[PDB]
Amino acid sequence: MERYENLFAQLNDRREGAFVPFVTLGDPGIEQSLKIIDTLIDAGADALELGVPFSDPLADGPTIQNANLRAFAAGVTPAQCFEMLALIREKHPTIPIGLLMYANLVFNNGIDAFYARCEQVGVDSVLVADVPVEESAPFRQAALRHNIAPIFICPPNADDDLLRQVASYGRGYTYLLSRSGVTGAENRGLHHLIEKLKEYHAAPALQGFGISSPEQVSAAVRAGAAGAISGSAIVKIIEKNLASPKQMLAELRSFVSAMKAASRA
């Protein structure tokens, strides 16, 4: 499909950046996770980034580490995640859905089969966090074969060759890393990269890592990014309100609405 392409064209018209929340599928349970995701969308999420729980998430800090642990405590499996994704797409036909994957979950029982499953449930993109462009050939080939956008990372230490590869190999959006390190709202994190990506006709850039406030969202848009991703800030609201599922959704709605408002220029 063309869900990212359609989204960015609409946002372009409305003079808007995208706001894209991340959560872990099945955190803190399947049913509450589905409600959380519906709340994110109703509150103004332009797209979703959704993590499949993985035993050893090496690009994630403690907040999202503990999200993965909560989902596992609820018995969440990749199979159950794909059932969730199907339900989400059934409810929401146009919102772009991207998965955050670790390589072994994609590789496990066949790379091609993984991307085929993504296509079946209506996923639009897959970001494999521990597969650099250098190792990406079978992943991006399988992705394109099944109409999935493979997402690649433009780090702050990116050189020209990486920029050209990311622009060529990637579809849907380009991930603009705010900083080195791992995910975390505690650690807050470039025009030359944004400009070069546009020169090489890369997919629109979403800034991610350490974005936890509306001011950072506004600033990313001002910089020329097409939008911003926030994960740990969202997940902290879940963690804080485990015993209060009703307040959890209210506070999620308030936060997402505020972040989305800041994307509007």
Binding site: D56, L58, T77, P78, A103, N104, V131, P132, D159, S180
Partner: protein, 395 residues
């Protein structure tokens, strides 16, 4: 793009977040440059000789092979400064770190021997060292925690996951992904992303080089087999490397069988896992049907790891090396036997290799065979663990 091949057949690669690729390429370039730099090689050789105590002895067993046709030598890496083979390649990587302008060192450790090595090299060469160690290992290898801290290293207990070596590896890599500008990740085994399996092999290969020279001097021939325990794979590849092109020499790697392969509580992914991608590499791993990484188990902290270095997976696949497993109880008996009959207290890791050699002898006692066991470390770190066990058994 790399200068050297990141793969051993299907195995290996550089499966790290994109942020870390320049650090890995920098390290590779630094290594290739150092390997042809006569001054680097001289500095490394001087440290190995005059600081670490190389060459290490090759000891002929006098008693434990009695009544059999097995001749058994022990390559005495237990006599290296620090008490294990880990010290060899740490000295090389620390010199690499200095060469690259790094002032800090990150390391993971399970048995605490790599931690001790990283700490002593950092103290010698003026680097600030922090060490991740699983909380379970902090307890069962406690003497090395004390040793690391006395040498001024920061020891950070890891409580996530199994609280053992894989979890220390995870945290070390997470740390490096944010601190690579000033910290070198001194990976302690022949695993992880390229170039580490290659660098660790090349900085450990003096083990096998010395062994070959020593066995030729004492026996006038090459060994029938060399035998080494395998966690991540560094002491074994260090012993194996110089013998790989000697096709008559058996290469036998010994993974931990834990409570028994059938219990699922072991650390033998090379022979009882399946290929996956984790810790920066494509390699055999213990994993669930779903592709979650399984927790390993071994009585030995140094072997308690659910994957294995890619060069071992390759050497296995082509049949150049053979891999076996040894249970906790087999390793404990080998430990006791070496203590009482040769007066050497071996690391419990190394005891797995010795246990397999003892099996080779006992199963076929009239087979003529000349064997070398890599005695990768001394057992001082294990004596409290082993005693506690040998009290719940009477003894």
């Amino acid at each position: 793009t790399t200068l050297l091949n990141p793969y051993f057949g299907e195995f290996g690669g550089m499966y790290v977040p994109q942020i870390l690729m320049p650090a890995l390429n920098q390290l590779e370039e630094a290594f290739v440059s150092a390997q042809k730099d006569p001054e680097f090689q001289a500095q490394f050789a001087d440290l190995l000789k005059n600081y670490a105590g190389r060459p290490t002895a090759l000891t002929k067993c006098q008693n434990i092979t009695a009544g059999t046709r097995t001749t058994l030598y022990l390559k005495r890496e237990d006599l290296l400064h620090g008490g294990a083979h880990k010290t060899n390649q740490v000295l090389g990587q620390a010199l690499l770190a200095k060469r690259m302008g790094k002032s800090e060192i990150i390391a993971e450790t399970g048995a605490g021997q790599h931690g001790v090595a990283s700490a002593l090299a950092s103290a010698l060469l003026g680097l600030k060292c922090r060490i991740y160690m699983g909380a379970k290992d902090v307890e069962r290898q406690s003497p090395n925690v004390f040793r690391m801290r006395l040498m001024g290293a920061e020891v950070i207990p890891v409580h996530s996951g199994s609280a053992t070596l894989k979890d220390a590896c995870n945290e070390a890599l997470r740390d490096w992904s944010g601190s690579y500008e000033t910290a070198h990740y001194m990976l302690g085994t022949a695993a992880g992303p390229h170039p580490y399996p290659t660098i660790v092999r090349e900085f450990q290969r003096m083990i096998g080089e010395e062994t070959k020279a020593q066995i030729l001097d004492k026996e006038g021939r090459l060994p029938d087999a060399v035998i080494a325990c395998v966690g991540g794979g560094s002491n074994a590849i260090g012993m194996f490397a110089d013998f790989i092109n000697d096709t008559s020499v058996g290469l036998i790697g010994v993974e931990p069988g834990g409570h028994g392969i059938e219990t699922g509580e072991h650390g033998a992914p090379l022979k009882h896992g399946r290929v996956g991608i984790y810790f920066g590499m494509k390699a055999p791993m213990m994993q669930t049907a779903d592709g979650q990484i399984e927790e390993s188990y071994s009585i030995s902290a140094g072997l308690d790891f659910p994957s294995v270095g890619p060069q071992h997976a390759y050497l296995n696949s082509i049949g150049r090396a053979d891999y076996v497993s040894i249970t906790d109880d087999e390793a404990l008996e080998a430990f006791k036997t070496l203590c009482r009959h040769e007066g050497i207290i071996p690391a419990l890791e190394s005891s797995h290799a010795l246990a397999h050699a003892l099996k080779m002898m006992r199963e076929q006692p009239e087979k003529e065979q000349l064997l070398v066991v890599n005695l990768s470390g001394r057992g001082d770190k294990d004596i409290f663990t082993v005693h506690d066990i040998l009290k719940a058994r009477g003894e």
